[PDB]
Amino acid sequence: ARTIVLQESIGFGEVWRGKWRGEEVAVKIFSSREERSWFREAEIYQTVMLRHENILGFIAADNKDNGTWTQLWLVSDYHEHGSLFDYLNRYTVTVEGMIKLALSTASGLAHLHMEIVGTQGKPAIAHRDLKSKNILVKKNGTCCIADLGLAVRHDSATDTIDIAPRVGTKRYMAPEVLDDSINMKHFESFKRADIYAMGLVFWEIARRCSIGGIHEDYQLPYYDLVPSDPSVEEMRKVVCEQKLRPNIPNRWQSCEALRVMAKIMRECWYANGAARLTALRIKKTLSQLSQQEGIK
Ligand SMILES: CC#CCn1cc(N(CC2CC2)c2nc(C(N)=O)c(-c3cc(C(=O)N(C)C)c[nH]3)s2)cn1
Numbered sequence: 001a002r003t004i005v006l007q008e009s010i011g012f013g014e015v016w017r018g019k020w021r022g023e024e025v026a027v028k029i030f031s032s033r034e035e036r037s038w039f040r041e042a043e044i045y046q047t048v049m050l051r052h053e054n055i056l057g058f059i060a061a062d063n064k065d066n067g068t069w070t071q072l073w074l075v076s077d078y079h080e081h082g083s084l085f086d087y088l089n090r091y092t093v094t095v096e097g098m099i100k101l102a103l104s105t106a107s108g109l110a111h112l113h114m115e116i117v118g119t120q121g122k123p124a125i126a127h128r129d130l131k132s133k134n135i136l137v138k139k140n141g142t143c144c145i146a147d148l149g150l151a152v153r154h155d156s157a158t159d160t161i162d163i164a165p166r167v168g169t170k171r172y173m174a175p176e177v178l179d180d181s182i183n184m185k186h187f188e189s190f191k192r193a194d195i196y197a198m199g200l201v202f203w204e205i206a207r208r209c210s211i212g213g214i215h216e217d218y219q220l221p222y223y224d225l226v227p228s229d230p231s232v233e234e235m236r237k238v239v240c241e242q243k244l245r246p247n248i249p250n251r252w253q254s255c256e257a258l259r260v261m262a263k264i265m266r267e268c269w270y271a272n273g274a275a276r277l278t279a280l281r282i283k284k285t286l287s288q289l290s291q292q293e294g295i296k
Contacts, residue, residue, distance in 0.1 A: 004019065047125065061073065080173075108145040
């Protein structure tokens with residue numbers, strides 16, 4: 001923190017583009033009264049064997065005293081494209097482009113979800129706030145997952161969670177979170193809730209897949225059913241009571257890649273978390289799709 005110069009506001013806490021010896025970094029800055037949120041996110045990022053090409057690259061947790069108040073810093077790799085939300089608003093994608101964004105997101109989530117067993121292993125982690133606004137797009141057109149502050153970690157020996165857990169973004173909350181039926185002592189239930197949210201993100205990507213000049217406008221999931229900044233009650237009435245999901249355009253049946261993406265979405269969107277695909281199964285499916293004749 002001592003040797004980083006903040007240059008530009010780029011969106012708990014606030015995010016800046018900084019320079020460390022002339023190299024661009026991203027800095028999320030918290031106030032003294034946000035220490036618990038800063039510490040918890042620092043803790044998640046310092047998890048043994050967390051580093052992965054599809055998880056935002058951690059550089060440091062640090063303090064900076066400006067002479068009046070102390071700032072709490074989280075420093076990461078800088079990605080010029082910023083959030084998948086901003087990227088999908090600005091650009092359309094090719095079939096290959098769509099699969100790369102979806103596969104890289106699934107690979108990041110499969111890694112978070114995966115317990116790497118050992119005396120020195122990585123615990124399984126559930127994100128609990130996955131959305132297009134906290135996935136970043138790298139220069140190579142792959143995604144990495146950020147904003148890990150609400151994550152929960154699994155102790156597989158006792159089947160317990162490392163903290164005492166409706167915390168995340170209301171629009172992306174799983175049906176079982178919206179109606180508060182989720183078993184918050186059951187780690188597997190948090191993994192299944194992440195899959196529902198990733199299905200919504202896949203729908204946002206697929207809309208922007210342009211074939212023969214044809215694509216949908218960028219929209220958030222449920223743009224057609226709830227107000228901007230929706231309440232838990234507004235979301236619950238649509239997702240749980242009326243049992244609606246984002247609409248699958250008829251266009252997506254014209255293309256094998258979009259057909260497979262649409263099938264993944266419906267198998268992420270079941271009301272019962274136990275019925276949903278795993279991140280690893282989605283990663284396997286999109287890996288196979290990426291190499292298919294007519295796609296590759
Ligand atoms: C460990 C750690 C850490 C730091 N950290 C940083 C974030 N967030 C916020 C985001 C996840 C919600 C971000 N990171 C980056 C980045 N890495 O380039 C962001 C970015 C925005 C733009 C951009 O929009 N423009 C226009 C340059 C370009 N890049 S926005 C969260 N935590």
